[PDB]
Amino acid sequence: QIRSLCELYGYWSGNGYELLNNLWGKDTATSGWQCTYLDGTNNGGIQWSTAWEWQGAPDNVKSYPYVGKQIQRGRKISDINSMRTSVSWTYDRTDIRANVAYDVFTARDPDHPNWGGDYELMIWLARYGGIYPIGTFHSQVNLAGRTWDLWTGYNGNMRVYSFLPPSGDIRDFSCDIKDFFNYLERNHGYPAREQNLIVYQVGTECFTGGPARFTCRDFRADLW
Numbered sequence: 613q614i615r616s617l618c619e620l621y622g623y624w625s626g627n628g629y630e631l632l633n634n635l636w637g638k639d640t641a642t643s644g645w646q647c648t649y650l651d652g653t654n655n656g657g658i659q660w661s662t663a664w665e666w667q668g669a670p671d672n673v674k675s676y677p678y679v680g681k682q683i684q685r686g687r688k689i690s691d692i693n694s695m696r697t698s699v700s701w702t703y704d705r706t707d708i709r710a711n712v713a714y715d716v717f718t719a720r721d722p723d724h725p726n727w728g729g730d731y732e733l734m735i736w737l738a739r740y741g742g743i744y745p746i747g748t749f750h751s752q753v754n755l756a757g758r759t760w761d762l763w764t765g766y767n768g769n770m771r772v773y774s775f776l777p778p779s780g781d782i783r784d785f786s787c788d789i790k791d792f793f794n795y796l797e798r799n800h801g802y803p804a805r806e807q808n809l810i811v812y813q814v815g816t817e818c819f820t821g822g823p824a825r826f827t828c829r830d831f832r833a834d835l836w
């Protein structure tokens with residue numbers, strides 16, 4: 613690896629991207645740790661990985677190490693035409709409580725901190741070990757060439773929309789996240805004209821299990 617980010621909130625940035633050893637829930641663990649590795653910044657993308665083992669509190673996320681596309685504050689979702697992104701990844705085992713997911717926060721306050729927002733949009737590419745997203749099943753949705761189970765609910769005051777694979781995982785994926793926002797704007801009253809983009813990330817929420825290793829063979833993200 614080029615860089616080893618094994619500290620709590622170990623951080624790298626470059627080429628318009630950032631990487632964080634985001635162990636935000638680790639104090640709920642009874643044992644374990646996690647490191648995030650920058651493997652490469654080849655071909656306009658990021659190659660990275662994270663190794664971990666966690667025990668305790670099986671409904672509590674211990675971490676969400678991520679790669680993020682850096683963005684300028686104050687961009688209304690309605691004024692973003694496209695959020696084209698692709699990811700290729702593997703997990704070395706699936707007998708773990710973990711996901712792989714895109715995470716996007718928006719807020720009416722353009723200076724909202726990066727830990728949350730008024731709304732959260734997740735796109736899950738894996739759902740291992742019997743975990744659930746926030747909330748309850750809403751409906752099925754056709755986007756990005758696939759069918760999704762949309763779940764909705766609240767984390768505090770924040771409305772969370774999670775799009776899940778009905779079956780299996782999706783280890784090679786590409787989409788335009790604006791298709792997902794546009795769907796929410798039309799059918800869920802999502803106030804895109806009032807909401808500013810806060811973060812634009814992909815990573816893995818880790819609950820329990822391991823030793824496990826997530827490898828992101830390639831990540832790219834753009835927005836116009």
Ligand SMILES: OC[C@H]1O[C@@H](O[C@H]2[C@H](O)[C@@H](O)[C@H](O[C@H]3[C@H](O)[C@@H](O)[C@H](O[C@H]4[C@H](O)[C@@H](O)[C@H](O)O[C@@H]4CO)O[C@@H]3CO)O[C@@H]2CO)[C@H](O)[C@@H](O)[C@@H]1O
Nearest residue numbers: 636671673675676715726727732743744745746767772817
């Ligand atoms: O909290 C600040 C922290 O947030 C991090 O971002 C979180 C979002 O806050 C969060 O909404 C979301 O994590 C979800 C996860 O997707 C769900 O699978 C999980 O569901 C739990 C649920 O909470 C329980 O009630 C239920 O019984 O069990 C299920 C699991 O089976 O809930 C969590 C939130 O608790 O996604 C984001 C990534 O972790 C930020 O990354 C960080 O910066 C912030 O400090």
